[PDB]
Amino acid sequence: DLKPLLDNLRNATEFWNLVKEASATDESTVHNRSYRDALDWLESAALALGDALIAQR
């Protein structure tokens, strides 16, 4: 059923990579609280998807 739970994680990954190369320049540059945001988004985006397939049969 749920095909929109993947682009949730994809945008969680695109946010991850944006913070990545923004941090690759120098960590000075990036708001220290977006690190946590990239992490908890990825965790909650992927917890909500893996728990969609475990119910599948």
């Binding site: 960590e27 220290n32 690190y35 946590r36 992490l39």
Partner: protein, 234 residues
Amino acid sequence: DGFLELERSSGKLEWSAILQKMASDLGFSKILFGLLPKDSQDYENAFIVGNYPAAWREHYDRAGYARVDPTVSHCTQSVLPIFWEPSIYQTRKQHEFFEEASAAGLVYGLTMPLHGARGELGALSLSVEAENRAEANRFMESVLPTLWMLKDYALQSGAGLAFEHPVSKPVVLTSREKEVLQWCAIGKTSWEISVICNCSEANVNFHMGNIRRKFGVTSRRVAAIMAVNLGLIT
């Protein structure tokens, strides 16, 4: 039973790193996993990984120590372990071989012969650091059944990835990634990392997430091993 971590491997050196990991978690410091095709018996150009000291490994091959080593001779005609007691070194060269192996810190240990379902032949050797032989053997008999199960798991998953040749692209790490991973390798917890580099705990959890994917692995302890293996850190 935790052995499953091996057959989920990206390739040769994630697998080689997981093998060293489990072998270290049991109590052995140095290990070697050798394997050969079905009826190749030239022990040169074999699939050999592990964490034997690189100085000793290069010397073992240039001296052709495979035809004098009492362990690999044993693996060609038996499927039971052979322990590195002084009894197995009988010839003039085996004694010279033995004294050189101890110089590389390989004084105590054992070798488990490997025989794959498709004809593979190899060895899985583990060395232990103890103060004396009595203390070493009490520990080796302590873990022999677990070790016996390990050699058959390492050969099933190993035989599938050993003779594959998918050239893995190189991996380069930032200035900060190598330092944050350097501390992870020597067992620093992620919070302990934050206070040394004057960053946030999520800053290192974020970094290691990039480090694990740059190596293609799913655990940071495994990625830290592959870094020292390739010489990229320490």
